[PDB]
Amino acid sequence: VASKAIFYHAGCPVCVSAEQAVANAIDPSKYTVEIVHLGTDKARIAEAEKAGVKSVPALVIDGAAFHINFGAGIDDLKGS
Amino acid sequence: VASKAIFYHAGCPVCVSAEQAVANAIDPSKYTVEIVHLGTDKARIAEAEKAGVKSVPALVIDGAAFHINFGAGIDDLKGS
């Protein structure tokens, strides 16, 4: 087993930077990196709200969503 | 490699959270995390600027600065 690290992002440039660097620097041995793309699935947005994802990209560790490099917020994805 | 990750903080509560989770997810066996406290050395603001550190609780990996959940603005600790 390992710790849980859920990485939410919408595929934004800033998100790619965090994914490529930080999310790849994290080893699946200690932390299971679960990347969730919000740039297509609008149903998972409701999940992000409750996960603690208020911006992207967000690294949810133990429930705490660390928003690494503010590219877009969840409000920016929340049109109507 | 064993390049260092430069973590700038200011003693704020957010520093602790980032240090506990993120700074252990990126262990020194991969990247040596260097804890830089601007609360101790104030003349290091000029260094942070050139490093790319626009805000505290943030880490610089191989040169790329990533702000963890946006800790505190560097200009919040600075006047003019």
PDB file of C-alpha atoms in Angstrom:
ATOM      1  CA  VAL A   1       0.000   0.000   0.000  1.00  0.00           C
ATOM      2  CA  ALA A   2       0.934   3.674  -0.245  1.00  0.00           C
ATOM      3  CA  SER A   3      -0.338   7.176   0.476  1.00  0.00           C
ATOM      4  CA  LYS A   4      -2.934   8.854  -1.733  1.00  0.00           C
ATOM      5  CA  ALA A   5      -2.104  11.872  -3.886  1.00  0.00           C
ATOM      6  CA  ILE A   6      -4.841  12.898  -6.300  1.00  0.00           C
ATOM      7  CA  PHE A   7      -3.764  15.411  -8.931  1.00  0.00           C
ATOM      8  CA  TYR A   8      -6.630  17.428 -10.415  1.00  0.00           C
ATOM      9  CA  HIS A   9      -6.031  19.655 -13.435  1.00  0.00           C
ATOM     10  CA  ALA A  10      -7.803  20.744 -16.624  1.00  0.00           C
ATOM     11  CA  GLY A  11      -4.823  20.285 -18.929  1.00  0.00           C
ATOM     12  CA  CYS A  12      -3.865  23.937 -18.621  1.00  0.00           C
ATOM     13  CA  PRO A  13      -0.243  24.913 -19.499  1.00  0.00           C
ATOM     14  CA  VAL A  14       0.513  25.733 -15.863  1.00  0.00           C
ATOM     15  CA  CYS A  15      -0.965  22.372 -14.878  1.00  0.00           C
ATOM     16  CA  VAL A  16       1.268  20.551 -17.358  1.00  0.00           C
ATOM     17  CA  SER A  17       4.291  22.228 -15.776  1.00  0.00           C
ATOM     18  CA  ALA A  18       3.289  20.976 -12.323  1.00  0.00           C
ATOM     19  CA  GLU A  19       2.412  17.505 -13.617  1.00  0.00           C
ATOM     20  CA  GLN A  20       5.623  17.084 -15.612  1.00  0.00           C
ATOM     21  CA  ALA A  21       7.820  18.315 -12.770  1.00  0.00           C
ATOM     22  CA  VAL A  22       6.180  17.814  -9.376  1.00  0.00           C
ATOM     23  CA  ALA A  23       3.778  14.960 -10.157  1.00  0.00           C
ATOM     24  CA  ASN A  24       6.608  13.071 -11.867  1.00  0.00           C
ATOM     25  CA  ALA A  25       9.012  13.802  -9.013  1.00  0.00           C
ATOM     26  CA  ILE A  26       6.638  12.012  -6.667  1.00  0.00           C
ATOM     27  CA  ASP A  27       7.297   8.281  -6.480  1.00  0.00           C
ATOM     28  CA  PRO A  28       4.315   5.873  -6.633  1.00  0.00           C
ATOM     29  CA  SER A  29       6.107   3.915  -3.916  1.00  0.00           C
ATOM     30  CA  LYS A  30       5.251   6.430  -1.199  1.00  0.00           C
ATOM     31  CA  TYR A  31       2.448   8.315  -2.932  1.00  0.00           C
ATOM     32  CA  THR A  32      -0.009   6.940  -5.455  1.00  0.00           C
ATOM     33  CA  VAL A  33      -0.424   9.786  -7.943  1.00  0.00           C
ATOM     34  CA  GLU A  34      -3.992   9.744  -9.227  1.00  0.00           C
ATOM     35  CA  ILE A  35      -4.217  12.339 -11.983  1.00  0.00           C
ATOM     36  CA  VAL A  36      -7.732  13.495 -12.827  1.00  0.00           C
ATOM     37  CA  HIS A  37      -8.218  15.521 -15.999  1.00  0.00           C
ATOM     38  CA  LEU A  38     -10.985  18.097 -15.610  1.00  0.00           C
ATOM     39  CA  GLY A  39     -10.565  19.479 -19.116  1.00  0.00           C
ATOM     40  CA  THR A  40     -13.171  17.142 -20.567  1.00  0.00           C
ATOM     41  CA  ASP A  41     -15.214  15.481 -17.839  1.00  0.00           C
ATOM     42  CA  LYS A  42     -17.567  18.106 -16.417  1.00  0.00           C
ATOM     43  CA  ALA A  43     -19.142  15.599 -14.040  1.00  0.00           C
ATOM     44  CA  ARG A  44     -15.945  15.210 -12.022  1.00  0.00           C
ATOM     45  CA  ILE A  45     -16.089  18.951 -11.330  1.00  0.00           C
ATOM     46  CA  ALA A  46     -18.672  18.208  -8.635  1.00  0.00           C
ATOM     47  CA  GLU A  47     -16.156  15.759  -7.177  1.00  0.00           C
ATOM     48  CA  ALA A  48     -13.352  18.333  -7.238  1.00  0.00           C
ATOM     49  CA  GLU A  49     -15.438  20.786  -5.184  1.00  0.00           C
ATOM     50  CA  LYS A  50     -15.737  18.289  -2.348  1.00  0.00           C
ATOM     51  CA  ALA A  51     -12.200  16.946  -2.680  1.00  0.00           C
ATOM     52  CA  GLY A  52     -10.985  20.438  -1.866  1.00  0.00           C
ATOM     53  CA  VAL A  53      -9.977  21.361  -5.386  1.00  0.00           C
ATOM     54  CA  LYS A  54     -10.756  25.048  -5.728  1.00  0.00           C
ATOM     55  CA  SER A  55      -8.055  25.676  -8.320  1.00  0.00           C
ATOM     56  CA  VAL A  56      -5.939  23.757 -10.828  1.00  0.00           C
ATOM     57  CA  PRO A  57      -3.615  22.126 -10.680  1.00  0.00           C
ATOM     58  CA  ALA A  58      -4.332  20.735  -7.217  1.00  0.00           C
ATOM     59  CA  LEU A  59      -2.376  17.982  -5.492  1.00  0.00           C
ATOM     60  CA  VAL A  60      -4.704  16.333  -2.986  1.00  0.00           C
ATOM     61  CA  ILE A  61      -2.589  14.680  -0.297  1.00  0.00           C
ATOM     62  CA  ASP A  62      -4.541  13.106   2.584  1.00  0.00           C
ATOM     63  CA  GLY A  63      -7.481  15.257   1.547  1.00  0.00           C
ATOM     64  CA  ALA A  64      -5.449  18.459   1.512  1.00  0.00           C
ATOM     65  CA  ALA A  65      -5.433  19.897  -1.997  1.00  0.00           C
ATOM     66  CA  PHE A  66      -2.153  21.718  -2.547  1.00  0.00           C
ATOM     67  CA  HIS A  67      -2.803  24.079  -5.449  1.00  0.00           C
ATOM     68  CA  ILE A  68       0.621  24.147  -7.095  1.00  0.00           C
ATOM     69  CA  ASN A  69       1.028  27.211  -9.337  1.00  0.00           C
ATOM     70  CA  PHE A  70      -2.257  29.049  -9.764  1.00  0.00           C
ATOM     71  CA  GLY A  71      -3.200  28.688 -13.406  1.00  0.00           C
ATOM     72  CA  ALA A  72      -6.966  28.512 -13.222  1.00  0.00           C
ATOM     73  CA  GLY A  73      -9.512  28.245 -10.450  1.00  0.00           C
ATOM     74  CA  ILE A  74     -12.507  25.940 -10.236  1.00  0.00           C
ATOM     75  CA  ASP A  75     -14.575  29.092 -10.765  1.00  0.00           C
ATOM     76  CA  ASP A  76     -12.809  29.476 -14.110  1.00  0.00           C
ATOM     77  CA  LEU A  77     -14.167  26.064 -15.051  1.00  0.00           C
ATOM     78  CA  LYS A  78     -17.533  26.897 -13.524  1.00  0.00           C
ATOM     79  CA  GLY A  79     -19.375  28.797 -16.224  1.00  0.00           C
ATOM     80  CA  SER A  80     -23.030  28.065 -15.601  1.00  0.00           C
TER      81      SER A  80
ATOM     82  CA  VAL B   1      20.906  13.130  -9.991  1.00  0.00           C
ATOM     83  CA  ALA B   2      20.549  14.654  -6.539  1.00  0.00           C
ATOM     84  CA  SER B   3      19.751  18.285  -7.314  1.00  0.00           C
ATOM     85  CA  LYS B   4      18.289  20.342  -4.489  1.00  0.00           C
ATOM     86  CA  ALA B   5      14.732  21.551  -4.143  1.00  0.00           C
ATOM     87  CA  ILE B   6      14.710  24.980  -2.540  1.00  0.00           C
ATOM     88  CA  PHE B   7      11.736  25.449  -0.238  1.00  0.00           C
ATOM     89  CA  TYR B   8      11.074  29.026   0.826  1.00  0.00           C
ATOM     90  CA  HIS B   9       8.771  29.625   3.776  1.00  0.00           C
ATOM     91  CA  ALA B  10       7.972  32.324   6.331  1.00  0.00           C
ATOM     92  CA  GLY B  11       6.853  30.330   9.363  1.00  0.00           C
ATOM     93  CA  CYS B  12       3.212  30.685   8.314  1.00  0.00           C
ATOM     94  CA  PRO B  13       0.855  27.718   9.070  1.00  0.00           C
ATOM     95  CA  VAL B  14       0.790  26.815   5.362  1.00  0.00           C
ATOM     96  CA  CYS B  15       4.556  26.210   5.543  1.00  0.00           C
ATOM     97  CA  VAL B  16       4.035  23.342   7.965  1.00  0.00           C
ATOM     98  CA  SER B  17       1.387  21.635   5.840  1.00  0.00           C
ATOM     99  CA  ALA B  18       3.550  21.849   2.717  1.00  0.00           C
ATOM    100  CA  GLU B  19       6.619  20.689   4.633  1.00  0.00           C
ATOM    101  CA  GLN B  20       4.821  17.677   6.109  1.00  0.00           C
ATOM    102  CA  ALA B  21       3.261  16.355   2.912  1.00  0.00           C
ATOM    103  CA  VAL B  22       5.045  17.782  -0.130  1.00  0.00           C
ATOM    104  CA  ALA B  23       8.557  17.932   1.347  1.00  0.00           C
ATOM    105  CA  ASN B  24       8.296  14.254   2.318  1.00  0.00           C
ATOM    106  CA  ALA B  25       6.774  13.191  -0.993  1.00  0.00           C
ATOM    107  CA  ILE B  26       9.887  14.654  -2.558  1.00  0.00           C
ATOM    108  CA  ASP B  27      12.470  12.939  -0.378  1.00  0.00           C
ATOM    109  CA  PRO B  28      16.209  13.873  -0.478  1.00  0.00           C
ATOM    110  CA  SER B  29      17.032  10.500  -2.056  1.00  0.00           C
ATOM    111  CA  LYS B  30      15.584  12.006  -5.219  1.00  0.00           C
ATOM    112  CA  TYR B  31      15.879  15.733  -4.544  1.00  0.00           C
ATOM    113  CA  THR B  32      17.593  17.249  -1.512  1.00  0.00           C
ATOM    114  CA  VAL B  33      15.032  19.618  -0.003  1.00  0.00           C
ATOM    115  CA  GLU B  34      16.661  22.795   1.274  1.00  0.00           C
ATOM    116  CA  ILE B  35      14.491  24.567   3.846  1.00  0.00           C
ATOM    117  CA  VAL B  36      14.943  28.331   3.528  1.00  0.00           C
ATOM    118  CA  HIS B  37      13.246  30.411   6.211  1.00  0.00           C
ATOM    119  CA  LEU B  38      12.920  34.085   5.277  1.00  0.00           C
ATOM    120  CA  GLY B  39      11.871  34.691   8.862  1.00  0.00           C
ATOM    121  CA  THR B  40      15.472  34.094   9.863  1.00  0.00           C
ATOM    122  CA  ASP B  41      17.229  35.854   6.985  1.00  0.00           C
ATOM    123  CA  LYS B  42      15.425  38.893   5.596  1.00  0.00           C
ATOM    124  CA  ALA B  43      18.190  39.888   3.181  1.00  0.00           C
ATOM    125  CA  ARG B  44      17.372  36.701   1.279  1.00  0.00           C
ATOM    126  CA  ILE B  45      14.376  38.351  -0.393  1.00  0.00           C
ATOM    127  CA  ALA B  46      16.706  39.460  -3.193  1.00  0.00           C
ATOM    128  CA  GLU B  47      17.765  35.835  -3.638  1.00  0.00           C
ATOM    129  CA  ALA B  48      14.170  34.613  -3.734  1.00  0.00           C
ATOM    130  CA  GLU B  49      13.346  37.109  -6.493  1.00  0.00           C
ATOM    131  CA  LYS B  50      16.116  35.832  -8.760  1.00  0.00           C
ATOM    132  CA  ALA B  51      15.223  32.228  -7.941  1.00  0.00           C
ATOM    133  CA  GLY B  52      11.713  32.853  -9.223  1.00  0.00           C
ATOM    134  CA  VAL B  53      10.079  32.833  -5.815  1.00  0.00           C
ATOM    135  CA  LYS B  54       7.101  35.175  -5.993  1.00  0.00           C
ATOM    136  CA  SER B  55       5.601  33.794  -2.800  1.00  0.00           C
ATOM    137  CA  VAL B  56       6.597  31.779   0.262  1.00  0.00           C
ATOM    138  CA  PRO B  57       5.479  28.236   0.862  1.00  0.00           C
ATOM    139  CA  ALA B  58       6.937  27.361  -2.522  1.00  0.00           C
ATOM    140  CA  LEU B  59       9.716  25.089  -3.773  1.00  0.00           C
ATOM    141  CA  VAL B  60      12.278  25.547  -6.529  1.00  0.00           C
ATOM    142  CA  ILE B  61      13.031  22.288  -8.343  1.00  0.00           C
ATOM    143  CA  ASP B  62      16.140  22.327 -10.571  1.00  0.00           C
ATOM    144  CA  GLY B  63      15.485  26.024 -11.132  1.00  0.00           C
ATOM    145  CA  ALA B  64      11.736  25.938 -11.684  1.00  0.00           C
ATOM    146  CA  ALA B  65       9.815  27.581  -8.848  1.00  0.00           C
ATOM    147  CA  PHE B  66       6.505  26.000  -7.877  1.00  0.00           C
ATOM    148  CA  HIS B  67       4.220  27.790  -5.434  1.00  0.00           C
ATOM    149  CA  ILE B  68       2.518  25.389  -3.031  1.00  0.00           C
ATOM    150  CA  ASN B  69      -1.121  26.462  -2.659  1.00  0.00           C
ATOM    151  CA  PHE B  70       0.142  30.056  -2.781  1.00  0.00           C
ATOM    152  CA  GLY B  71       1.602  30.529   0.678  1.00  0.00           C
ATOM    153  CA  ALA B  72       2.311  34.221   1.118  1.00  0.00           C
ATOM    154  CA  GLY B  73       3.252  36.877  -1.412  1.00  0.00           C
ATOM    155  CA  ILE B  74       6.905  37.928  -1.302  1.00  0.00           C
ATOM    156  CA  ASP B  75       5.813  41.563  -1.539  1.00  0.00           C
ATOM    157  CA  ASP B  76       3.690  41.067   1.585  1.00  0.00           C
ATOM    158  CA  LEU B  77       6.891  40.736   3.594  1.00  0.00           C
ATOM    159  CA  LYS B  78       8.357  43.639   1.661  1.00  0.00           C
ATOM    160  CA  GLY B  79       7.642  47.351   1.555  1.00  0.00           C
ATOM    161  CA  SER B  80       9.058  49.571  -1.158  1.00  0.00           C
TER     162      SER B  80
END
